[PDB]
Amino acid sequence: SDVRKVGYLRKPKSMHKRFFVLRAASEAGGPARLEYYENEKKWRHKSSAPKRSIPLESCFNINKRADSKNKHLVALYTRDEHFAIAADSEAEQDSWYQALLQLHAFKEVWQVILKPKGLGQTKNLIGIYRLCLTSKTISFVKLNSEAAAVVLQLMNIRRCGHSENFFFIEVGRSAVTGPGEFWMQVDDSVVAQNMHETILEAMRAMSDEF
Amino acid sequence: DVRKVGYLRKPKSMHKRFFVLRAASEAGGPARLEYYENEKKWRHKSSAPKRSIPLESCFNINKRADSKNKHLVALYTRDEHFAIAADSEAEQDSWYQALLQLHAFKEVWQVILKPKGLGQTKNLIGIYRLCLTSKTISFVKLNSEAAAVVLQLMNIRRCGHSENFFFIEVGRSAVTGPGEFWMQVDDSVVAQNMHETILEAMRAMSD
């Protein structure tokens, strides 16, 4: 009856304990949504509105993440933002992640900051975009947008790399954008490194397809 | 019949030997690279060349470089790899072009296929020749004329080097199945270079 999962989880930034509440869809209470309150008392006593109430139907992607600060993140990607919650363990991270999918496209999704360097300036793709990875392509979807600015084939990426909290993608002449690099900033060197390893692995995994 | 002449060093012993390039003649013999103890022996026709390698037997000729010699010109025949060390990039190029003028693969490296991984499993051990084209990598056992295996560049997952070693890990789509070929080379300078050259070959495919 409404509440599927409940518990204290941390906000990745300020790292404050907030009491989260996952609720199933109902014809009275409202849609499937993830909410959080200042603490548990305010929820129990119905003495406050949730500080945030995110509908699951608006989340196009849900992933388990990690950075230099928080080892067990669970990230939600809607058309307008990236909402993350910091679990205290891999076990807890998976429970929430699993609960969310139980009530809720791309293999991976990363929110990045496309710099004006290289193809950034030449193709005018700067600011906040979402790097969406499949088994065969990488798309750059602008924040607040539902359609892709550009789709790159994994086959056309000559190389990719990272330096500090930056990550780049060099595409060959056979790419839709022509040759050039795509530079983008991320939270820290940890996430920049995972971005590199995951995409590279997806590049290498192509030789495994018959 | 003499096309080019001069002192070069034997890469191994670093001895100074007098090399003579000869065009084919219907009297003196076929196009060939030969060398003498010194110039006097060649001028005075008082000695047989220490070596006489016919060009028609060289399937590939390459400019090379390792930790000991920076300007090598290598000849690859069915049975051996013969390298000459020049004293500069200019001289290496001069000889390289002359040899080509009288004379398949973009690159050819002779390697020591180790019994690690796909080496033992496919019984590809010992001296082989890694032959690189723009789209493939072929392994030709020394003394042989046909390639043991032909790897499509698209099938390689990753290649790298460690010390004087170089590996190639292929994917499932490989004709040999997944796994890795380990091969030893002269030094780290050559392993690194194979890595780069080949890697660029993998990346250049997206162009």
Swiss-Prot record, chain B:
Modification sites for Phosphoserine: 88
Source taxon at top rank: Eukaryota
Segments forming domain PH: 1-103
Segments of this protein annotated with the region Mediates interaction with PHIP: 1-103
Residue ranges occupied by any IRS-type PTB domain in the UniProt entry: 105-207
UniProt modification remark: Serine phosphorylation of IRS1 is a mechanism for insulin resistance. Phosphorylated by ALK. Phosphorylated on tyrosine residues in response to insulin. Ubiquitinated by the Cul7-RING(FBXW8) complex in a mTOR-dependent manner, leading to its degradation: the Cul7-RING(FBXW8) complex recognizes and binds IRS1 previously phosphorylated by S6 kinase (RPS6KB1 or RPS6KB2). Ubiquitinated by TRAF4 through 'Lys-29' linkage; this ubiquitination regulates the interaction of IRS1 with IGFR and IRS1 tyrosine phosphorylation upon IGF1 stimulation.
Positions of disulphide bridges: none
Subcellular location: Cytoplasm; Nucleus
Role, per record: Signaling adapter protein that participates in the signal transduction from two prominent receptor tyrosine kinases, insulin receptor/INSR and insulin-like growth factor I receptor/IGF1R. Plays therefore an important role in development, growth, glucose homeostasis as well as lipid metabolism. Upon phosphorylation by the insulin receptor, functions as a signaling scaffold that propagates insulin action through binding to SH2 domain-containing proteins including the p85 regulatory subunit of PI3K, NCK1, NCK2, GRB2 or SHP2.
Assembly mode: Interacts with UBTF and PIK3CA. Interacts (via phosphorylated YXXM motifs) with PIK3R1. Interacts with ROCK1 and FER. Interacts (via PH domain) with PHIP. Interacts with GRB2. Interacts with SOCS7. Interacts (via IRS-type PTB domain) with IGF1R and INSR (via the tyrosine-phosphorylated NPXY motif). Interacts with ALK. Interacts with EIF2AK2/PKR. Interacts with GKAP1. Interacts with DGKZ in the absence of insulin; insulin stimulation decreases this interaction. Found in a ternary complex with DGKZ and PIP5K1A in the absence of insulin stimulation.
Disease implicated: Type 2 diabetes mellitus: A multifactorial disorder of glucose homeostasis caused by a lack of sensitivity to insulin. Affected individuals usually have an obese body habitus and manifestations of a metabolic syndrome characterized by diabetes, insulin resistance, hypertension and hypertriglyceridemia. The disease results in long-term complications that affect the eyes, kidneys, nerves, and blood vessels.
Protein's name according to its UniProt entry: Insulin receptor substrate 1
Full-protein interval shown: 12 to 262 of 1242
